Amino acid sequence: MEEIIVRGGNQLNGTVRIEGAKNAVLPILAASLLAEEGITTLDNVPILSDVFTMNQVIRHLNVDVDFDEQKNQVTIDASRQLEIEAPYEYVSQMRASIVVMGPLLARNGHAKVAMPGGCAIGKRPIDLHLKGFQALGAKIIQKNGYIEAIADELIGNTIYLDFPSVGATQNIMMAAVKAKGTTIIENVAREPEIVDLANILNKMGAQVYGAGTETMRIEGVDHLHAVNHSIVQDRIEAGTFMVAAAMTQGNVLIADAISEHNRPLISKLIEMGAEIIEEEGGVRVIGPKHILPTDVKTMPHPGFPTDMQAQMTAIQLVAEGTSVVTETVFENRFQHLEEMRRMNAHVKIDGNVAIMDGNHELQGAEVYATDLRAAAALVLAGLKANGITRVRNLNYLDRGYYNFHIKLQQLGADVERVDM
Amino acid sequence: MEEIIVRGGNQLNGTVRIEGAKNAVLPILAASLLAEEGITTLDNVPILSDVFTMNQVIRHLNVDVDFDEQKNQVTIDASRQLEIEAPYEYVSQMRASIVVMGPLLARNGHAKVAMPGGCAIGKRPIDLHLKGFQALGAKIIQKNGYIEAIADELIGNTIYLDFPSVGATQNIMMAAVKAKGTTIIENVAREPEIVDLANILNKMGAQVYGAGTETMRIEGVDHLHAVNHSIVQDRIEAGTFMVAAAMTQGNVLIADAISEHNRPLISKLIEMGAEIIEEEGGVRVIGPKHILPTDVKTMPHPGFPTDMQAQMTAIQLVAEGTSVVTETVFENRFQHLEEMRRMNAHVKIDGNVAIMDGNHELQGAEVYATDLRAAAALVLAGLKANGITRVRNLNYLDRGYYNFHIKLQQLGADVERVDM
Amino acid sequence: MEEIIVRGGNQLNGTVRIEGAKNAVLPILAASLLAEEGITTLDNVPILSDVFTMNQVIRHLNVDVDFDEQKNQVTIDASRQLEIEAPYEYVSQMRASIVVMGPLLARNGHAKVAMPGGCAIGKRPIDLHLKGFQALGAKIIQKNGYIEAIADELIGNTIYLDFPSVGATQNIMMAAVKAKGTTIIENVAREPEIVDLANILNKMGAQVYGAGTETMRIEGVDHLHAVNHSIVQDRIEAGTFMVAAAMTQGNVLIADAISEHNRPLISKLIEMGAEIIEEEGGVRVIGPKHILPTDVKTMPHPGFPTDMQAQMTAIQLVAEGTSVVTETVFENRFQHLEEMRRMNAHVKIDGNVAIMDGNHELQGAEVYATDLRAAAALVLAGLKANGITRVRNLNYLDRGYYNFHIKLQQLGADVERVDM
Amino acid sequence: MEEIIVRGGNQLNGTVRIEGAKNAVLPILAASLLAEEGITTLDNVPILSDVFTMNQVIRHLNVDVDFDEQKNQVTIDASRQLEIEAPYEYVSQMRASIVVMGPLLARNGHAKVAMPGGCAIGKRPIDLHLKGFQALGAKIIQKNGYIEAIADELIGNTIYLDFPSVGATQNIMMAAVKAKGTTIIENVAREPEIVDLANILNKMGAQVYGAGTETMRIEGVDHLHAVNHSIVQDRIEAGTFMVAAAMTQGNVLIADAISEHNRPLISKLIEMGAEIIEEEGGVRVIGPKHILPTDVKTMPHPGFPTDMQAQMTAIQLVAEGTSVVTETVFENRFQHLEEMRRMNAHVKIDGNVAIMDGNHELQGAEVYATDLRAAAALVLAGLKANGITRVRNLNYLDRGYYNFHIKLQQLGADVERVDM
Ligand SMILES: CC(=O)N[C@H]1[C@@H](OP(=O)(O)OP(=O)(O)OC[C@H]2O[C@@H](n3ccc(=O)[nH]c3=O)[C@H](O)[C@@H]2O)O[C@H](CO)[C@@H](O)[C@@H]1O[C@H](C)C(=O)O
Ligand SMILES: CC(=O)N[C@H]1[C@@H](OP(=O)(O)OP(=O)(O)OC[C@H]2O[C@@H](n3ccc(=O)[nH]c3=O)[C@H](O)[C@@H]2O)O[C@H](CO)[C@@H](O)[C@@H]1O[C@H](C)C(=O)O
Ligand SMILES: CC(=O)N[C@H]1[C@@H](OP(=O)(O)OP(=O)(O)OC[C@H]2O[C@@H](n3ccc(=O)[nH]c3=O)[C@H](O)[C@@H]2O)O[C@H](CO)[C@@H](O)[C@@H]1O[C@H](C)C(=O)O
Ligand SMILES: CC(=O)N[C@H]1[C@@H](OP(=O)(O)OP(=O)(O)OC[C@H]2O[C@@H](n3ccc(=O)[nH]c3=O)[C@H](O)[C@@H]2O)O[C@H](CO)[C@@H](O)[C@@H]1O[C@H](C)C(=O)O
């Protein structure tokens, strides 16, 4: 139905405000199920479709969720007896909805959640979630495409994660905060979203230590209460605008940006010639006249974030030389590069390596997004392409970016969103 | 808004008729553009959505195409001056539509075809097509997501294909049949569809030698005429039914099956315990009581066909042990296995290897197809799952299978196609 | 304790003679075990260490082998009762020595051959050899690092190879020529060495059809006799000199070169700017002033030979741009590129891809070969490096090249072989 | 010259003492170059060949090194003017010798170190070392296979490591401790060896903060002095004995073992059925009657250490089912599994994944080690193989294990080391 039309050749200048983090708000909404009494109030909630889906998931568990979009605020009342079922209708749209499994085990000792199927970008199975829950004393059945977890008594244990899975970390944390005794998670996810989740759980009465470090220690408690919490800024939306500034000879202040949440991206953009400055008001990015090539390798935090990879390929594809990207977190997250061949991108892909030759002008063309970050990457490429770029499948964009086109317009970009 | 409902536990018995090959009919329809005079009549044309799309592509080049579905017959009149443009509207639906580029170069010396974008299953770029056309004297421009190829005079040359690409082979053959002098294609595609294409071109007045071998030799001619041609049987539809018989303790005759077009699959099914017999009337497959594990590696013909891989994983997942599949032709063609986790499939994926443990019962669940062959694989899995399987996204199935559910019903399978 | 010293800066000019093929002579020596009566005489046998090793292997089976090095000729008398044991002392030096297993099964119905261990360049297991032998009626035991195969009666059967393994193809052919009835090998190796092996077996009284094609058919016979045979020219030694000419602005005639045995290499060198001509006396290679980049993908014949890959990286590393090589036949055959970093080669490796930037001068340095073809590649790099290159571990070079330095001197190259 | 002979079937019982860490002692020896005045005394130095090589490297820089093997003690006097050259004679034996580059830059502002060549197990280039040194103000030339780094004034800077390279981390830390101002290394190596290096540097008068965390901060100082330091226990030698106990139904106390240095291995061995207990005297491992399969993925610390991978495959290969290992740190570190096919190991390898079927008895055979940890893994496999295992290339074992056979004998293992 809709497309974003982009003309290139304009420098981005000004200030940009950033929404609260998609990847923090979804687990924190699930965390609100832990409050047996009181009203949870979340501030700085972004208006994204994944938030609407998660709000539906939670309502279907017998919970009142009001989203005041104007105030960017969600109130949750989970004080009634919860239902325990999250069907494929919701999990098929968004597999993040499975992080309700942990709170449901803590509250009810029972959860019945649809097994996620395929993802475009080539996701992992939920094996590490289940490993965690089994370690805490849960029995796991599968029938009719559902995972049913039952635990009369959750008991703390030592759990080693083979990979530092963000999702498994979140799911297990939220079960363990009400398990009897000590839980220790080794090789936890260290991402800033984990820290924000830990911060709210602690306010709710939990005891979570070492969030953001290699080892997390959780002391179980009997009762959790509701609190007010402001979602941390979205480091990926921030980073997307940092790339946009760096590739357009821009001068853009990302308001209240937390630089410690983008150490990799900042370092890499500086290697490509950008000047990046921490100021009282946020992080300023000044794009160079000559964009220099650099190689990028994605890894679990604190390495380079996979959620910045697609956006980063856009600037690598206009750099003056050959750049390489290696994706070690996702199996099939180069589909945007396949599309950008329509825009005359010279790129060779083999397995989880892509080789980009940026000594070619990008050309406007009609292009279809394949996933959330691919949509942003195609728009960014449009900022530097010659002619007119038309980006479609904006359903993907809306999952993670609010008012992307308007924020870009306000920075001087020639970007419209229109009907076909 | 349709689904296939499957109950497992039934043995397949009887005879099944197979349609003409999807992968032969699409390039042969393009080949019909070469006939400057006469009416081309194609018989044994399958009723698939890709055929409808290809018929539209060809009409938009100023050609009359009539499809009599009842007779499985298409007449083509390409005797008027051709237009040269194939837009993204069609190429985005089906990238096979680019094989019109070759005939357009031969007839007009001009072609303007949309550059294909991303494919779900992780396709190659069209670099080898363009390499071929440049070798024959074509200039190539890109603008607005179109490849424009201009050739005043096509001149035969020696062309080495880095990979034995079926599509590049087809596109180049069809340009070269009207080039001046000799063309030699080294490391050509050897697939049976190439042979059928060569067979019709030869009847049309062309001189193509060595089709099906490692080296193809083409002597250019001035004029090609229209002919009647019956499309070769679909070896992949045939093979799909061979797998179904082998996994259900079946006894199924695949009518008029060409066994030399399934040497790999036949050999592998026999390794898994099947008895397979060439008869006057076709190939009979008798499924064993104990399905034995086997490993599979996809390769260009004459190795194991990637188009049989998804179907083959279905039988590997009910074999009595661990089986391994290695996909060396496509990057991301294991998404069906991600879905089959909903059906309790125990499978580990890393890169282009998948490890399947078949000592677990499959379970019915709602499952969404991701691509043509994945849809067939999910139905086949349903035949052996306990409970009710519901397969969705039948738009993918209809691209390559005609009346799949009816043919299965006629073999004793409990399969319905119904509205939601 | 020898080294080759190379100074760069000279163009190669002249004629080069090529030895008989290492990869044909080793299996054909094994084939000579099949002759129960008579003296086998092989001509055009190269003086390489692998030939000396194979001659030892065969003597230990109670056979007389005389190597007249001056005449490049080996006589074999295998008319006595054969011993059946080939120990790890020999197989650990050279795993090609296992192709005696096939002839031993045909003559004796018994073979006891050491299981090969690891290879530097990352070889396959011998699973496909054993699959073939089991298919013909052989029982297989493993004990104390030996494979023991017993077959009272070999019986012809259909055998599908999952990969077109040269070694498995050779081993199975040589067992099957004396099996009762018809044998069919599907997805056989198509390499020219297979053809030469088939050619001698046929002269010896066997019936081997379709060698060099996708399907091989063998009709078993009761008796085989000894013959005279001239080994086919070594296409890899030939190809090595073609690369040397192409990278040094050379003009070199490779005497009596069979161009159909280097279709991929010839095509790729022409893509890099070389002019290559079939003449009465052989194949002439004329190197361009400007060496152009090209990408290379190794595959089973008829694709680009892995045995030419290392040599080809040498010319790719001096081409005017970025080139990519993809090795799909061996796991770890880029160790030469790791060494060439000492020569200032700019190359990035990930998995089975290597990315070479040739817009940098190579520099002479002391470098150690890691395997046969790496040794040749380092010498070739020396031809274009600035300064003095010293190549060591010439034990690897002598496995596959006879008088490499002298042949290069005769073409005008500044190459000496000296003691340390 | 020598082999280790192993008979299987015996349970390991007793206490084992562990040497100081190879991977700490080598960089700490290099660190001793920073002391311009005084005598450095290192305690708990293991008697390994890498220590002898490193001692030679350091002497050639005009330094006195005395190794009292009986006291496990090394004194270093680096108070004279240092020479700056480390030739290929030493770097070709052991690429760890390049970590002298950092201290040489700090002391002299000049270093001339041979570029490492190929490694068997498929190492990285030294790009990240050079990136670090360039960031601190060093000029880098390559000529004749040497890297020459010159820096009149080292100046602190922010450095992001694309990969958390242990070697690059060590080299950069040792330069930065004497750079002017603040250095910040982001995505540093977190390994315990880094911590021990930091601990000695701090005692020597340096200011290194955040060792073991994601970010390291270094404040430059003018002068460093000599100290006494006891090398931390070798966590890999410790872990090797933990595996040996776990696979032999053993009961072994690893004296003074630091469990926080083997969180991954301990967790994984417990998943395989072992009982592991922290005691006053160290860590006790009790091997189960039934060894259970588990999957293993190597990663930078704090994930599963690649230096434990080979040893771990030995226990995975006798577990009661199928296990998978994924090696994400090194490209070609599965060569031991290629050898263990001689011992009847059923294993499939593809890329950086290996699939092990442990429902087969291992068999003794002659087997050749390919690298340090492969040698240990083959001995461990011998402990469970039936018959006699003979492990050769003990030159590799001696690089990292002191008196391996004697420590195993003392635990009740049937292990001899003898001449051939
Ligand atoms: C929404 C979603 O499914 N994935 C998103 C995020 O969800 P989050 O709410 O933090 O948690 P989860 O959904 O429960 O977890 C994500 C799903 O994928 C597995 N996983 C988890 C962590 C990891 O590192 N790798 C990995 O594969 C995990 O098992 C679960 O099934 O987790 C990923 C972590 O890398 C993000 O990259 C991704 O962000 C998108 C892409 C973007 O912004 O571009
Ligand atoms: C839709 C269709 O007909 N495609 C099928 C047809 O290829 P073809 O019609 O010749 O192919 P193209 O799309 O016209 O070729 C253009 C596009 O296809 C890429 N390509 C083509 C050939 C090849 O070997 N490898 C390869 O990657 C090329 O890089 C470009 O993106 O036949 C092949 C085997 O015979 C199938 O693998 C292929 O997949 C169908 C769906 C299936 O499952 O049955
Ligand atoms: C000498 C050698 O080791 N093999 C060489 C030779 O095989 P050949 O001598 O005829 O055959 P075998 O070794 O007797 O074959 C038995 C052994 O070789 C493994 N194998 C065999 C075939 C194959 O395709 N792949 C493969 O891995 C099998 O797993 C077993 O260990 O010729 C092949 C192509 O003609 C080369 O690719 C190969 O490279 C050489 C080094 C080169 O650079 O010259
Ligand atoms: C030579 C030696 O002693 N090797 C050890 C170590 O050396 P280090 O003290 O870091 O000295 P360097 O080799 O000069 O290190 C520099 C070079 O080493 C590579 N590197 C280094 C770090 C890393 O994380 N990964 C990585 O690959 C890369 O090539 C780099 O250029 O490097 C590895 C670190 O992961 C260790 O696992 C390895 O231990 C052995 C195997 C064992 O005990 O089994």
Author numbering:
A (entry chain D), B (entry chain B), C (entry chain A), D (entry chain E): 1 to 420
Reproduce, without paraphrasing, sentences from the article in which this PDB structure was first reported.
In order to determine the structure of apo-MurAA, we also attempted to crystallize MurAA without added ligands or cofactors during purification and crystallization. Data were collected up to a resolution of 2.65 Å. Upon inspection of the electron density, we observed significant positive difference density near the thiol group of the active site cysteine (Cys119) and UDP-binding site at the interface of the two domains. This was surprising as we did not add any of the ligands during purification and crystallization. Based on these observations, we modeled the covalent modification at the active site cysteine as a Cys119-PEP adduct and UDP–MurNAc at the interface of two domains in E. faecium MurAA to form the dormant complex. The density for Cys-PEP adducts in all chains was well defined and unambiguous, but the electron density for UDP–MurNAc was found to be weaker and more variable across the individual copies of the asymmetric unit. The observed weaker electron density could be due to a lower occupancy of UDP–MurNAc and may be indicative of partial occupancy. Except for the position of the surface loop (Ala114–Ile126 with rmsd = 2.7 Å) the overall structures of MurAA are quite similar (C-alpha rmsd of 420 residues = 0.6 Å). In our previous study, we also identified a less common G220V substitution during the development of DAP resistance in E. faecium HOU515FΔliaR. Importantly, positions 149 and 220 are proximal to each other at the protein surface but distal to the active site consistent with a potential role in protein–protein interactions. The structures of E. faecium MurAA with FOS–UDP-GlcNAc and by serendipity UDP–MurNAc suggest that, like other members of the MurA family, the protein transitions from an open to closed conformation upon UDP-GlcNAc binding.
